Design a protein around this ligand. Structure first.
Ligand SMILES: *[C@@H]1O[C@H](CO)[C@@H](O[C@@H]2O[C@H](CO)[C@@H](O)[C@H](O)[C@H]2NC(C)=O)[C@H](O)[C@H]1NC(C)=O
Ligand SMILES: *[C@@H]1O[C@H](CO)[C@@H](O[C@@H]2O[C@H](CO)[C@@H](O)[C@H](O)[C@H]2NC(C)=O)[C@H](O)[C@H]1NC(C)=O
Ligand SMILES: *[C@@H]1O[C@H](CO)[C@@H](O[C@@H]2O[C@H](CO)[C@@H](O)[C@H](O)[C@H]2NC(C)=O)[C@H](O)[C@H]1NC(C)=O
Ligand SMILES: *[C@@H]1O[C@H](CO)[C@@H](O[C@@H]2O[C@H](CO)[C@@H](O)[C@H](O)[C@H]2NC(C)=O)[C@H](O)[C@H]1NC(C)=O
Ligand SMILES: *[C@@H]1O[C@H](CO)[C@@H](O[C@@H]2O[C@H](CO)[C@@H](O)[C@H](O)[C@H]2NC(C)=O)[C@H](O)[C@H]1NC(C)=O
Ligand SMILES: *[C@@H]1O[C@H](CO)[C@@H](O[C@@H]2O[C@H](CO)[C@@H](O)[C@H](O)[C@H]2NC(C)=O)[C@H](O)[C@H]1NC(C)=O
Ligand SMILES: *[C@@H]1O[C@H](CO)[C@@H](O)[C@H](O)[C@H]1NC(C)=O
Ligand SMILES: *[C@@H]1O[C@H](CO)[C@@H](O)[C@H](O)[C@H]1NC(C)=O
Ligand SMILES: *[C@@H]1O[C@H](CO)[C@@H](O)[C@H](O)[C@H]1NC(C)=O
Ligand SMILES: *[C@@H]1O[C@H](CO)[C@@H](O)[C@H](O)[C@H]1NC(C)=O
Lengths: 236, 364, 49
């Protein structure tokens, strides 16, 4: 039921400044009114991230994803190495009622999309190993961080009400952990899924690098400010 | 004091001898309400088991398996474990489980075992000699055997080769022992590999049907998922005890605290990596940890020549847990002092004690 | 055939160093106590050569 479209929905690959977004709680420890220095994977400050207004993108160490969501156009993600039943494949879809996570060897069409009149982007599904159902994830800003370390898939998320027109705001907001999954995959690429009816989506992508950060914990244990040590000499 | 000073005579003064510490009382464990039991009911209490050469396979992963109920269950005539002893099976576990269910005769029960050979063990299913796990066999003559003959069950009897480990053969190809090919019709040199069982309610012991389930455990590099429950006991308060809260092991006294954990933190620490607050997986409340008291001890003596009575001071210890009683006990900003009486007067300082007070000999 | 030599096979707990234990008792392999009766889940710890 999946075929390629007529025209090419080549979204413009623009560039934009990261500013001070992409900070998450690295663990589940509670600290009150203290400055803590840590070393982990982070999105560097004031980096350039890619803006899409739907190709294959490498996974690398981790992924930071952002969406200026308007009326819930984006639907889910696909992860894998060769993107076929010859290898493993992870599918995550947030439909109208719940979120579904599947670990199987799918046979996806060239240009998947959910479509409306459930899942039909895959021609076959065999040897399914892991299944998961939970509460749905979703003029809003949706920020997600995906990491895959030692056979563990970590998803952090945050939702923000924003009023700015085009780009990311000049603000700070930590990302709370959302999901941990005990599944061993060696993902290298990922995609994006749209609910396209037969008849232009803006989002931002950035990568993660290992470095050291300084974080400030207030009285209640909420991160309010951070400093990137590998920057201009004043920060160091 | 004589021991520490290595002398038989001691002059007037205060000397530090040893230390004091409060021992833990009892131990506690704490784990969540636990759930997601493995669905073993549909395996052993299944309606009907398939054929021996078409044995059913069940994959068990991401659940908790209570082995105590099956270990104590006497409904199974044969329970042979080859991997590890079943008693400790509840603790050690593996990343995934395979359950192999079929039906054999009462005389074929010993075919299913590591390092065993036979018709079932070589033509219907193969158990590797390095197999790890357990085999559970139980009589089912009242159900599987039929009065008219249980010909529904079939077993493979003829095959050119044996079975590989963890291999299921359901092929119905006409076996040809001889050199004469057959065009799909059984002949002198051609026979059907599968023979029907003839179970009866009254057929004698050893020929009755027996349902066999083999549990095999595998430990691929993926994290382990399925094994026994984590028992937890009740908790106590205001007593120096040792605890293992969800893997965090330590000793101290547990009190109630008003700190506000944000809904995803588990435990907290202040500085220098020292845990202070924890959250119990069952009640979900914030508890505070304090190291139960300790401190040095000291002896005040007026000299060996004068007398031979002394006073004992515990430094930085509240006057609540000395043991014992001795004489009147006085609480000072420096600790707790026993063996001397407090007076209202004020003289020169003989044997310094601390916080602006000191003692002397008169009684002390 | 030499059968005068026997070796232990089952014991409640591991032996202490330089400890010689000679008493022989039935072993309760299963949950059901043998009560001094040899049978199911009960085997003699001494095996011959
Ligand atoms: C959204 O997805 C969920 C999960 O995939 C759907 O819930 C399933 O609905 C089918 C249809 O009857 C049931 O057979 C399944 O048992 C349901 N899942 C579970 C876990 O119970 C839901 O229907 C989907 N909603 C829409 C609008 O597509
Ligand atoms: C189908 O799934 C099974 C397991 O569900 C896969 O079998 C595993 O294959 C890996 C490959 O190296 C082995 O290391 C494991 O020991 C196998 N058994 C397990 C995990 O239980 C099988 O490879 C899958 N088939 C395909 C084509 O992906
Ligand atoms: C940090 O925690 C404190 C303690 O709960 C918060 O103070 C309370 O905040 C709530 C709602 O914000 C009020 O209803 C209470 O009256 C406050 N308690 C007082 C004033 O004693 C505080 O808001 C939290 N956040 C910050 C930034 O301090
Ligand atoms: C198969 O079903 C039987 C019948 O219910 C189970 O036997 C009972 O198990 C419960 C479990 O707590 C015990 O309280 C009963 O005393 C058992 N009955 C008898 C007569 O012993 C058996 O446990 C089930 N087996 C599996 C694997 O689910
Ligand atoms: C763990 O289980 C206990 C036991 O049922 C739960 O305690 C109950 O909590 C509700 C909510 O206030 C009370 O109304 C019940 O009276 C409690 N029952 C008992 C026996 O204490 C507890 O809520 C559970 N916790 C989690 C996190 O699941
Ligand atoms: C030793 O411990 C006791 C027990 O807490 C302390 O007694 C408390 O004293 C304060 C201050 O007067 C009171 O507010 C509390 O109500 C007392 N607690 C109890 C249970 O009575 C005592 O103060 C401690 N010793 C020292 C020197 O502080
Ligand atoms: C965009 O990326 C380029 C490097 O390709 C960089 O020189 C430039 O500063 C970036 N613009 C930003 C971060 O606004
Ligand atoms: C992913 O592929 C690499 C390349 O061979 C391999 O070393 C690694 O073990 C694989 N990871 C998983 C989870 O299979
Ligand atoms: C006897 O004890 C007193 C106590 O102050 C001391 O001053 C004196 O030197 C002692 N005499 C001795 C040990 O001969
Ligand atoms: C004197 O000692 C008594 C003890 O009976 C005490 O109650 C009182 O407070 C003391 N007065 C002074 C001035 O130390």
């Amino acid at each position: 039921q999946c075929v390629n479209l007529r025209t090419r929905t080549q979204l413009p690959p623009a560039y934009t400044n990261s500013f001070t977004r992409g900070v998450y709680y690295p663990d589940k420890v509670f600290r009150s009114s203290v400055l803590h220095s840590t070393q982990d994977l982070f999105l560097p400050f004031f980096s350039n991230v890619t803006w899409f207004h739907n190709p294959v993108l490498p996974f690398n160490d981790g992924v930071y994803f952002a969406s200026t969501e308007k009326s819930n156009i984006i639907r889910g993600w696909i992860f894998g190495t060769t993107l076929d039943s010859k290898t493993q494949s992870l599918l995550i879809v947030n439909n109208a009622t719940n979120v579904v996570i599947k670990v199987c060897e799918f046979q996806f069409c060239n240009d998947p999309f959910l479509d409306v009149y459930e899942s039909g982007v895959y021609s076959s599904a065999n040897n399914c190993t892991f299944e998961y159902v939970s509460q749905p994830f979703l003029k809003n800003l949706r920020e997600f961080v995906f990491k895959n370390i030692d056979g563990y898939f970590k998803i952090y998320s945050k939702h923000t009400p924003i009023n700015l027109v085009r780009d990311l705001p000049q603000g700070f907001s930590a990302l709370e952990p959302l999901v941990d999954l005990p599944i061993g995959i060696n993902i290298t690429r990922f995609q994006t899924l749209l609910a396209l009816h037969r008849s232009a989506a803006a989002y931002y992508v950035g990568y993660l690098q290992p470095r050291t950060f300084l974080l400030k914990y207030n009285e209640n244990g909420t991160i309010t400010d951070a400093v990137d040590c590998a920057l201009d000499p004043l920060s160091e | 004091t004589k021991c520490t000073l290595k002398s038989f005579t001691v002059e007037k003064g205060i000397y530090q001898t040893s230390n004091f510490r409060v021992q833990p009382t009892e131990s506690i464990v704490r784990f969540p309400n636990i759930t997601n039991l493995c669905p073993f009911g549909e395996v052993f209490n299944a309606t009907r088991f398939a054929s021996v050469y078409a044995w059913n396979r069940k994959r068990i992963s991401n659940c908790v398996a209570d082995y105590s109920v099956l270990y104590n269950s006497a409904s199974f005539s044969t329970f042979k474990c080859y991997g590890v002893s079943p008693t400790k099976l509840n603790d050690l576990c593996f990343t995934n489980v395979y359950a192999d269910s079929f039906v054999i005769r009462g005389d074929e029960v010993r075919q299913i075992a590591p390092g065993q050979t036979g018709k079932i063990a070589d033509y219907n299913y193969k158990l590797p000699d390095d197999f790890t796990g357990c085999v559970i066999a139980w009589n089912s003559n009242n159900l599987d055997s039929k009065v008219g003959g249980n010909y529904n069950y079939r077993y493979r009897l003829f095959r050119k080769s044996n079975l590989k480990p963890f291999e299921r053969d359901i092929s119905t190809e006409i076996y040809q022992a001889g050199s004469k090919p057959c065009n799909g019709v059984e002949g002198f040199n051609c026979y059907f590999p599968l023979q029907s069982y003839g179970f009866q309610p009254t057929n004698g012991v050893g020929y009755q049907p027996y349902r066999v389930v083999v549990l095999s455990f595998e430990l691929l590099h993926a994290p382990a998922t399925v094994c026994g429950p984590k028992k937890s006991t009740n908790l106590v308060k205001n007593k120096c005890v040792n605890f293992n809260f969800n893997g965090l092991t330590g000793t101290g006294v547990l009190t109630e605290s008003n700190k506000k954990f944000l809904p995803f933190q588990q435990f907290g620490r202040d500085i220098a990596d020292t845990t202070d607050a924890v959250r119990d997986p069952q009640t979900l409340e914030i508890l505070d940890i304090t190291p139960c008291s300790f401190g040095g001890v000291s002896v005040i003596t007026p000299g060996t020549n004068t007398s031979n009575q002394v006073a004992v001071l515990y430094q930085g210890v509240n006057c609540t847990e000395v043991p014992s009683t001795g004489s009147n006990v006085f609480q000072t900003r420096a600790g707790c002092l026993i063996g001397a009486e407090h007076v209202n007067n004020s003289y020169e300082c003989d044997i310094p004690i601390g916080a602006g007070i000191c003692a002397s000999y008169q009684s002390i």
